[PDB]
């Protein structure tokens, strides 16, 4: 199962190499897994993980939300782990045939497949929670064991948890900005994953410093 | 008004190294205008291929991006992808309401288009997407998204769609020759088809696209 420092995975979404590389910099004593997104590699390119890598040595988990086609889906991954990604974020919406194609690159690689079951914004509600818990059951079905849901509804949270069992590694995001608790996530996921409330604050360390006080007993 | 597409006829260019994407854009160029380019190209050699495609071809060129993030960071996948030349970008409608929103207002700032996928071509889109993609399509019509992506697959599915979305709307589909779909068939319903493997894995692309556009003569 993946280590992550502190239960705390930064979500790197600031598009200017300079404040991406400064802001990350600033918070690597409190984190060893960065989460990598297009904001940032369609701003700055792919090389960008390589040098994430150099840096910081962190774990590197790209939150590409694949959901294509089965054909294109093994591209997509193809190119996210040569470009050094440890783990992709796949959505589960398209289906197990999508899935099973990135769980193959996946296998080739040595790397991770994440799936994505339900997300933490307001729309969500419409489509995407009303099948989260068929998705779940299907990443169970494939062999799925790494997985993302949503800090903003913590019942929802925990259902995800329920169907996937403890030994399932669950991270979060939605902490922070979009209104979820650090601790009260962390009662079922393995990771919290925060993006703005860190690299948007005034002082990037000291929110990072400040979140981890606040989960202090769950470390 | 809508995108003028050559020959009723997209390229899915999906090769992932720069020299033989080049090659088989420039070899089907006095074929078709229009260019789909997604993230197996965009990963592989940077968000500048447009701006190469862009000054080495005359042609238009949508960004398949599949956008299918939180209305935060769908803002600023569309910024970037504007930013680096995109005519247009396709989303995800199932992320929801919000979503597709954030993106028709960096689209309307930025003077580009938002296409909505509403049901995809795979077998896999049985699962879950079909059975929202009604109301997907609906919800696109009431956000005012005049651009639409739907699969050639199921005649009966974008026969539906064209319905939901109406004569004025613009509708592209995917899904023709390698997944199936029939490129006449699928004009009946769809402005455009588009078409990747078909012609960039042809040991002769040209004549791949001159023999697909034979097939629809009668059609343009
Ligand atoms: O359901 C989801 C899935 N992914 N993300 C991603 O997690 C990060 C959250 O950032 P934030 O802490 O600044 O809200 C962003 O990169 C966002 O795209 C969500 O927010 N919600
Ligand atoms: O529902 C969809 C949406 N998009 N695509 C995209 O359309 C292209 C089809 O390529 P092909 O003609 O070689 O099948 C590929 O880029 C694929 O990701 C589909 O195939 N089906």
């Known amino acids: 199962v993946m280590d992550v420092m502190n239960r705390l995975i930064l979500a790197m979404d600031l598009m200017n190499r300079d404040d991406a590389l400064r802001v990350t910099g600033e918070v690597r004593e409190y984190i060893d897994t960065v989460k990598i997104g297009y904001p940032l590699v369609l701003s700055e390119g792919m090389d960008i993980i390589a040098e994430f890598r150099k840096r910081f040595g962190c774990r590197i988990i790209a939150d590409f939300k694949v959901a294509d086609i089965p054909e294109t889906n093994e591209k997509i991954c193809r190119a996210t782990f040569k470009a050094g990604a440890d783990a992709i974020i796949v959505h589960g919406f398209p289906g197990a045939?999508?899935?099973?194609?990135?769980?193959?690159?996946?296998?080739?690689?040595?790397?991770?497949?994440?799936?994505?079951?339900?997300?933490?914004?307001?729309?969500?509600?419409?489509?995407?929670?009303?099948?989260?818990?068929?998705?779940?059951?299907?990443?169970?079905?494939?062999?799925?064991?790494?997985?993302?849901?949503?800090?903003?509804?913590?019942?929802?949270?925990?259902?995800?948890?329920?169907?996937?069992?403890?030994?399932?590694?669950?991270?979060?995001?939605?902490?922070?900005?979009?209104?979820?608790?650090?601790?009260?996530?962390?009662?079922?996921?393995?990771?919290?994953?925060?993006?703005?409330?860190?690299?948007?604050?005034?002082?990037?360390?000291?929110?990072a410093a400040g979140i981890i006080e606040s989960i202090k007993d769950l470390l």
């Open 97 to 207: 045939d999508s899935v099973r194609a990135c769980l193959n690159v996946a296998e080739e690689m040595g790397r991770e497949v994440f799936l994505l079951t339900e997300m933490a914004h307001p729309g969500a509600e419409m489509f995407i929670q009303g099948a989260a818990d068929e998705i779940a059951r299907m990443g169970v079905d494939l062999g799925v064991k790494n997985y993302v849901g949503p800090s903003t509804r913590p019942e929802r949270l925990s259902r995800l948890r329920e169907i996937i069992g403890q030994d399932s590694f669950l991270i979060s995001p939605g902490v922070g900005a979009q209104g979820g608790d650090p601790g009260e996530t962390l009662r079922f996921a393995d990771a919290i994953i925060v993006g703005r409330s860190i690299y948007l604050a005034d002082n990037p360390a000291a929110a």
